[PDB]
Amino acid sequence: GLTEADVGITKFVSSHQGFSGILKERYSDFVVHEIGKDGRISHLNDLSIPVPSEDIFTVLTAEEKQRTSVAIEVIEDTKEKRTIIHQAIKSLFPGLETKTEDREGKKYIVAYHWPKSRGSYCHFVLYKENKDTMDAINVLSKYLRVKPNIFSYMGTKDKRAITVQEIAVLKITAQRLAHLNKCLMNFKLGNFSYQKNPLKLGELQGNHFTVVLRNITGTDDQVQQAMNSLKEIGFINYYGMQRFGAVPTYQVGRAILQNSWTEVMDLILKPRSGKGYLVKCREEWAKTKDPTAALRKLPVKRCVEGQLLRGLSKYGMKNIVSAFGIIPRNNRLMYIHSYQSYVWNNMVSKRIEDYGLKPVPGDLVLKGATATYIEEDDVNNYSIHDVVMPLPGFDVIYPKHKIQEAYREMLTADNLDIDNMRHKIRDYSLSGAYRKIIIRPQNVSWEVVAYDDPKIPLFNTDVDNLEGKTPPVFASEGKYRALKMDFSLPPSTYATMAIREVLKMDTSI
């Protein structure tokens, strides 16, 4: 329903003829490896627990001392070797009795009933398949009987994909985490270390992508030209379709900024084209206009519709400001940020159309963390990769060319004032920020692969390598053709926008 043109995604970098290709046909055709603060590319490649009773038996005995018996096998049997185990168990045995048993030749030691030197945080790699980051944290939180806020990460990674990232957890041992691997299906944990600090959102350097575009209709000339342009110049740094949502998020954001609160409520709760349970909740709302009656139709507690319905039950339909205010702050800002994103995509497309892919006088540039202007005389000292455009807000400056006039027109068309982007409600006041218009991906590599079966993955994942799965080998000719790409992107960048530039085809399905 919502197209790329609807959200201002209309321009391309390369002049090459577009071609077709299938994206995320299998979640194994889209693989993401996080690039850490220090440049390390997270891979699940070590299951060792950092340093007679191994890590498992110690966990088994600790689990026994709290909430029948723990039998430890005596590998190299000796009177001194058995007593050593009795004494070693007695160290990690607060309230545990110990007895030697000879079970038909095989001997056992049967158990009956955080250092300040070691950093507070266990860091580890989380490998996930078709899952959200928060979803993995909730599973680990319920298994470890902890609250999800003791976990930290640098960013969330795509659900429909195989993703690998670093996670930190306050005061949970590596053995406790590793033990969970036996009962976790769509996630695995490894690469354990103990460190001083948690992770911080946005601290990452970016992500590395391995992408398989199935059934490419492109020729070798088309592919080479598409890839060379992506490697040399790159792609227009648009906000992808994910930024815009079922409910078109920028429209809720616009209504919030205009203080059109009845419209905010209707946009979230009223029935619309294209999740089954949300359809029923919205139908019950349209029929009864009763929060209690519509809440009965929601199987999920933490969702925007439920939080707003709980807010309306508390404050009523004559105080939608307070009712909506109940939604967590992060979910509320997301609407107004996607409105800023909508304006930004449109402005960038106008900037490309009117001045091209060259820095022009009047453009804003980023000299480290400071934003400044390109003048007539210093125009040739900058590249298109230094050019920034602002997300609209009260604290930003605008380019000194005609796009400033276009920002003013777009904002005026929504009854908003570029000269005063302050909201009467503090939470909805936007300061603005700067975003690069063109991104050159790093460590770009590609190959066209001939194949016959779509089910067959074209490369190993981290778990395939751990299990010692045979690396895929492919013939020089086949029925179908695939474009296999590898590239690194900075944070707040969309891989779909890089793929869009290669294929020159719109993101629908």
SSE layout and pairing:
Layout: E1 30-35, H1 55-66, E2 70-73, H2 79-89, E3 97-103, E4 106-112, E5 121-129, H3 133-144, E6 151-153, E7 162-170, H4 174-179, E8 187-195, E9 206-213, H5 220-232, E10 235-236, H6 249-257, H7 261-269, H8 276-288, H9 291-295, H10 304-315, H11 320-324, H12 329-355, E11 364-367, E12 370-373, E13 387-391, H13 403-413, E14 433-436, E15 438-439, E16 442-451, H14 462-467, E17 480-489, H15 495-503
Parallel strand pairs: 1-7
Antiparallel strand pairs: 1-9, 2-4, 3-4, 5-7, 5-8, 6-7, 9-17, 10-15, 11-12, 11-13, 13-14, 16-17
Helix pairs in contact: 5-15, 6-7, 6-12, 12-13
CATH class descriptor name of the largest domain: Alpha Beta
Distance between the termini: 10 Å
Query: How many structural domains in the coordinates?
Result: 5
CATH superfamily of the largest domain: TruD, catalytic domain
Q: How helix-rich are the residues, as a percent range? A: 25-40%
Helices, by number, come to 15
The structure class reads alpha+beta
Q: How can the largest sheet be summarized?
A: 8 strands, mixed
Number of strands: 17
* Approximate shape: globular
